[PDB]
Design a protein around this ligand. Structure first.
Ligand SMILES: Nc1ncnc2c1ncn2[C@@H]1O[C@H](COP(=O)(O)OP(=O)(O)OP(O)(O)=S)[C@@H](O)[C@H]1O
Ligand SMILES: Nc1ncnc2c1ncn2[C@@H]1O[C@H](COP(=O)(O)OP(=O)(O)OP(O)(O)=S)[C@@H](O)[C@H]1O
Ligand SMILES: [Mg+2]
Ligand SMILES: [Mg+2]
Ligand SMILES: [Zn+2]
Lengths: 432, 339, 432, 432, 87
DNA sequence: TCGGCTG
RNA sequence: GCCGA
DNA sequence: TTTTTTTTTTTT
């Protein structure tokens, strides 16, 4: 890819602005490529700008080489084109080429060092290092990654850091005062959050409640039904939005006239967004399938989801790991990391629920250790709530949400808070 | 294991099988036979996939048709239980005693026996007219004219061979071929290759040896001072100063002289893993191997470079002299070049 | 000189008694020499003595070799004879040959490693280390010597012990006097320190507290975040060193004018270093990547690190074990080894943080048999701490440090102590 | 192998007197070997003495041999040498050859028997054995062993057992009259012993002292330490050996001159053993390791130990147990069993320490029931000494040692004893 | 029509954005076409975009298959070319 | 239409 | 089975 | 070598 490297050095400023800091004549070859890069280096040294093909030819004419080298360099020069390919692929590929050639150079150097070492001191060459320099010579050749960024400074970049503080565009509100209060502006994009609860305690209920709350806030929500069907999930969403008890829905207490009226009234609102719900067979969808669904959505409809809700992470099937390749801890943590990567790619708050081992399915409190699946999930995640319900809570219709893992804010300011869950409406009500 | 008893019992238990052939080369003992497990093919009677290799530390029967590879004892158990018990008993019987097979270590070889004096039905290339079809073909080959005194043209190649080695062909059908005489160190021809003409000859493009002990290296008599370059084609060697070419499917380092200064110049194919195997076996011996990893040309052989990419011999020589690596240095280029 | 080495291994006793334990079958060519050494080693294992030539012939006769191998071994043994020479040249020449043939084998190994690395996925095999491991192997080969120190030999090694008595290593002091007291003045330079804890209990909090203290102590600090953005870690440091709560920063309670004033008041302080925060994606950085970052920091920013602080040890790429190849224990142990090697190389007091097992979560006490990803960390680490803020320490706004692994002093002197962790300021205070 | 066997029959006295009773004329061959052994047997029968080479040649001169047999026997006789091979290998190899040839003869005999059986009974050989005796014949094949020593045979080794009794070939003294009084001669080889530290006793100190006392008696000792550094353990050893207080070593009251003088004075004494301190990470050392360490010490430092003191049993690791814990009954039981197996297989005394329960802590009297690791350790520990320190004994500078379990002797003979512990000197002295 | 399918997979964003999610390796052949699609899929996984011809040549150079397969893939890539077509 | 080819 | 004629 | 479910067992 040396030809590509030189072509994009000559006919691109962005590439030259990020790969010229890491470039040595020892990388390319001992043939025409070496002399061509030497010409480029000389031209940029004498006049601090990238040359042109005419300028390169003039430099080649002025420079002195043998006839074979002259012809080879001229032929290579004639084989240069703009070819405006992708920038990310270009920089990654040239970084790979640099690393491989650096490894080759270091290995050849240590081989020459050993060959000199075997020679008698009278015969051997003093210029080369001693054998003791073999290790470092390798590691310096393993530290040539393409990265010009040193990062923050805390002293030379305080104004930019304050500006970054002023950019609250990452936060997303919750439509609930208590959640935003305990998350300091709500959840953030590409930030995995887990609302774990026991079986039949309200995981998918809470996820659909969050979907409805985000829908009433104008976002675009993608509800990934891992267990239920599309119609059932949409029925729960209607129970939250159209404010009609889920049962009533099945008992005909809402006439089609009233249903149509409520749906049209909600359509008339300009603050309402779009909500798309996709059902998936158990163990048959993950970040790869999710991105395929993302592309299909963005093509078929002008829909860019701002929230991604997963019905249950455990139901998902890992991308690289097969269906049951390894134990639960490895595969579930892999699923969690893949989902967090998908969220940070699409810059969307990724909500999901988790199950609790049998030790806490009837406990007044559930701790972080009571994660039925991998313990890596309460490590790959950010804002973890736990939903607890007892006989008293069921009588009071108040699920208790415990701030089990809080990356956003202080995990202990309001650790346990009572929610006003109305199971009939699939809705959460803050308590004042 | 006990390889000699394995070979003996394999010969005993495979001689009666159809299409049996005891292929015994000076270092290899193999048996060709129609595999009883599969039967090979009715058309492929002579193309019998049943093979036995006893040259290894163990005797293995492998058939590529049914993909049946097994130790000789397994075959004896599955097919010759009486012979199986005989073998399994006698292996233990001689297991306790010391191996005596080294006692009758004799060499049945002989010195130059069929020294080639003259070539009937052959006219040397430099003796031929400039408009001869073979001359035009070698002009397409772009061989330097001065070396044309080393190649002959024939039209009676089966007749020539049967005049040298009678009984090779039941029919002396006239066949034009490029006769390349392979000489010894002292300069006398010990074999000759009937190089195919046109795109390909009808059948049997093989180097005919005057005798089994004849040399397989071309141009040894023309070796001068300096490093010796070993190639794969005698015509390719004709483009190389101090360039010899091994002629045969077997590559023995011992028979190749100039251990101090022999340089292996092989093909320019990073693929074809057999080439990689050859390179690896050469470098494991710590030999001097040339590497095409930095070759500006991407052809297969040096003559291919010259004909297709317009390479010149001086460029070839300077690349070879600058691209000789040994030991770990060679292994580096081998590793990077292979893929 | 393999023939001479074998001859003096057979026909000599003092030579054997001096050189045998270091000899190995890997130090000989694949021809007759290796098989002869195999027979000799087998006999020595079976009878605890050097065999005679007749014994070697007997073993060769009762061996499974090829005709070529048998002939070669017999010829070599027949060539063995006692050459009367000095017992000073033989030992040194044997050591030279063993080092030379160790280096050849090592080099061949790194070539194989590179070949494996260049292979595509699936097709590439395993049981072979990653390219990043190449220097470490080259370090082992250069260390081969016939003077092996296995353990402290009382009445034999008493000079070194007295030197260790009278002399003490240089300590990089902490700003908390409790850590100095439990480390007898501070942390030694070439060390890998880890601050273990539970999830979301103050791993990064403790690392940032140490970073702020070391920045206030004038050292040069590098904070490599793998789970947080550069802005988040820099915000933690700002909260620690400006006495402004994170709630104040997020809510904007402090004005930008006051922020700039505090930044200038800190910059005008002479006894202040430079802290630089660099972020890599989870699993996107290794020890080689950290070395490249150090190179650019020394070149681009002219900053020489003193305190490297990595956010999460268990997230970093192995740097020597291909990604997703081995188990968790091997991968994390290799990560710890690579980080400690980098710390020793750059003479920087490295800090990291490891995650305890699910059993230790919400438990009043932890120990070594609680490390989640790998229990090999205490073997590799040089100073490890724990955080036990489970139920009531947070209610009391305090902490607890177990001092799990302490190579600086006696861990069973101040094993458990209370630290006033202030979460809003992201700092540690002393209860005294 | 036949040549070596015949040569060492002709030219040796010990090898002949050891291996002649198990040699038969059918063991060798049907040719030169058989005839040569026939000559040897004839000569040893007619004259009760091993023939000389010229005597064997004379026997060849006067005997019934065919021309080819005569030539073969003469050549083999001339091919007999007086090579001085070692003894153990010669015995083992001739035994192996004899057993292999006996197996071949028995197999040939049973095969010929089966061949004879499948014949018309009218035409058969009467002398051939019947088929039903085939299992017996093979038994006679396997009833061939030059040295028949399998286990200790009562009524057949009463003299050797009495010699072991009188010689005290198992005991190893303690340099303390009290311990030898309570152990009938001290600890025994191939045994494990444990010190049960109570409420703050210092498991290291006792093992430290015994380590010393064992050192002063000339025994090779190896203190594998876990919770301490090699320098710290060696410093305690110095405190016990040089009469220098441990804190005085830290302060520097004792100077280099006095230290080196005392060290050289101890070196002058010929009754001083060697102590090898080796450190291992806490929990990173199981019994199998110790085996490799012993192999390395024997091979490299020629150090063959008779005392192996491991710092702490609970801190150790089980040889093959995946789950590790700081204090678990199964782990301590496995560790005790593996360490005792190591002691038995090494023919060495092994010492370790262990902790007891709080009931043993508060009460001066400690019962085997009042043991943290009871049933487990008591089962595999040959000796168990409960070391208890009380405030009154602290004032009197003593400790109450109680013989909790003595496989060596009666428990109640001298159970409780006051020991003169000096913590500063880390020394144990007797009480008048 | 595998050549056409690949040509519009590379030189057409509209065609790719529709057909790609359903496309899979087992749909083309056991020869050059499968290897070309494998290279395309690997590049897509690496960069979430369609590679150019130069990128495919780079990937082909850094590949592992035999000379026959390499020649086939190079021939196919050389034969890849956008043509005026309808969606 | 032939021979030679690893597992 | 793949390669060479 | 961890890790998680479940069951069974056992010790304190
Ligand atoms: N159609 C419905 N009508 C009334 N109550 C319902 C209905 N569906 C669910 N619930 C109640 O909602 C709670 C659990 O429902 P879901 O949230 O759908 O289950 P989940 O949270 O997904 O957890 P699991 O383990 O998958 S059942 C229980 O209290 C149910 O009684
Ligand atoms: N913005 C914030 N404001 C106040 N407290 C916070 C904030 N963010 C985090 N915390 C607190 O920080 C504590 C520990 O957070 P971390 O720094 O992430 O510790 P941690 O062990 O690194 O967690 P990890 O990295 O997810 S394992 C939590 O208990 C929170 O209460
Ligand atoms: Mg559900
Ligand atoms: Mg954190
Ligand atoms: Zn077959």
């Amino acid at each position: 890819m040396v030809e590509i490297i030189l072509s994009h050095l000559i006919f691109d400023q962005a590439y030259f602005s990020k790969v010229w800091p890491y470039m040595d004549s020892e990388y390319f070859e001992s043939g025409p490529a070496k002399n061509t890069f030497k010409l480029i280096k000389s031209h940029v040294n004498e006049y601090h700008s990238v040359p042109s093909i005419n300028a390169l030819n003039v430099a080649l004419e002025n420079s002195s080489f043998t006839e074979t080298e002259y012809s080879g360099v001229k032929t290579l020069i004639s084989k240069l084109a703009d070819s405006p390919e992708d920038h990310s692929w270009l920089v990654k590929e040239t970084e790979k080429y640099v690393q491989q050639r650096a490894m080759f150079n270091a290995t050849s150097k240590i081989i020459e060092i050993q060959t000199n070492a075997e020679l008698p001191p009278e015969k051997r060459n003093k210029k080369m290092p001693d054998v003791g320099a073999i290790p470092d010579i390798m590691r310096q050749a393993l530290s040539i990654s393409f990265d010009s960024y040193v990062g923050h400074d805390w002293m030379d970049d305080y104004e930019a850091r304050w500006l970054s503080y002023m950019n609250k565009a990452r936060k997303v509100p919750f439509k609930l005062r208590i959640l935003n209060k305990i998350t300091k502006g709500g959840a953030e994009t590409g930030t995995l959050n887990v609302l774990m609860a026991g079986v039949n305690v309200g995981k998918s209920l809470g996820l659909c409640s969050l979907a409805a709350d985000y829908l009433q806030l104008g976002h675009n929500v993608l509800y990934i039904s891992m267990q239920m069907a599309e119609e059932v999930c949409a029925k729960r969403i209607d129970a939250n939005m159209l404010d009609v008890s889920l049962d009533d829905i099945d008992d005909g207490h809402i006439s089609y006239a009233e249903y149509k009226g409520k749906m049209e009234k909600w359509r008339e609102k300009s603050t309402l967004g779009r909500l798309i719900v996709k059902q998936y067979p158990t163990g048959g969808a993950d970040a790869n399938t999710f991105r395929s669904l993302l592309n299909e959505l963005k093509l078929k409809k002008n829909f860019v989801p701002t929230i991604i809700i997963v019905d249950y992470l455990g139901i998902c099937k890992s991308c690289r790991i097969r269906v049951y390749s390894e134990n639960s801890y490895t595969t579930v943590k892999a699923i969690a990391e893949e989902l967090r990567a998908l969220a940070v790619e699409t810059e969307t708050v990724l909500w999901t629920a988790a199950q609790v081992g049998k030790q806490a399915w009837d406990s007044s409190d559930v701790n972080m250790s009571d994660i039925a699946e991998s313990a890596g999930l309460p490590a790959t995640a950010d804002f973890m709530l736990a939903v607890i319900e007892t006989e008293e809570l069921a009588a009071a219709e108040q699920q208790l949400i415990k701030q089990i893992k809080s990356r956003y804010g202080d995990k202990n300011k309001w650790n346990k808070f009572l929610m006003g869950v109305q199971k009939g409406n699939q809705k959460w009500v803050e308590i004042e | 294991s006990i390889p000699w008893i394995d070979n003996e019992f394999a010969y005993r238990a495979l001689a009666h099988l159809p299409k049996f052939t005891q292929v015994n080369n000076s270092s290899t003992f193999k048996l060709r036979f129609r595999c009883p497990v599969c039967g090979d093919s009715k058309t492929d009677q002579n193309k019998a996939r049943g093979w036995y290799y006893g040259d290894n530390n163990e005797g293995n029967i492998h058939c590529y048709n049914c993909n049946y590879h097994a130790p000789i004892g397994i075959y004896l158990k599955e097919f010759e239980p009486d012979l199986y018990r005989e073998y399994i008993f006698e292996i233990r019987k001689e297991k306790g005693k010391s191996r005596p097979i080294e006692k009758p270590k004799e060499l049945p070889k002989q010195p130059e026996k069929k020294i080639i004096k003259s070539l009937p039905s052959c006219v040397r290339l430099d003796k031929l007219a400039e408009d001869h079809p073979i001359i035009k073909y070698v002009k397409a080959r772009c061989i330097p004219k001065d070396k044309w005194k080393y190649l002959w043209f024939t039209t009676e190649w089966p007749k020539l061979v049967n005049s040298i080695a009678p009984g090779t062909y039941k029919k002396e059908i006239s066949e034009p071929r490029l006769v390349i005489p392979i000489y010894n160190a002292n300069g006398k021809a010990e074999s000759f290759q009937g190089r195919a003409l046109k795109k390909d000859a009808p059948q049997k493009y093989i180097t005919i040896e005057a005798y089994p002990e004849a040399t397989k290296i071309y141009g040894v008599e023309r070796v001068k001072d300096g490093d010796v370059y070993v190639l794969e084609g005698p015509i390719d060697s004709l483009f190389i100063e101090n360039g010899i070419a091994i002629t045969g499917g077997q590559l023995d380092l011992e028979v190749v002289p100039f251990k101090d200064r022999r340089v292996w110049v092989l093909d320019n194919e990073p693929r074809h893993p057999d080439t990689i195997k050859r390179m690896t076996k050469l470098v494991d011996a710590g030999e001097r191997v040339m590497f095409w990893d930095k070759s500006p040309w991407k052809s297969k052989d040096v003559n291919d470079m010259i004909r297709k990419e317009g390479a010149t011999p001086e460029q070839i020589m300077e690349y070879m002299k600058n691209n000789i690596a040994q030991g770990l240095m060679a292994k580096m280029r081998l590793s990077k070049y292979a893929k």
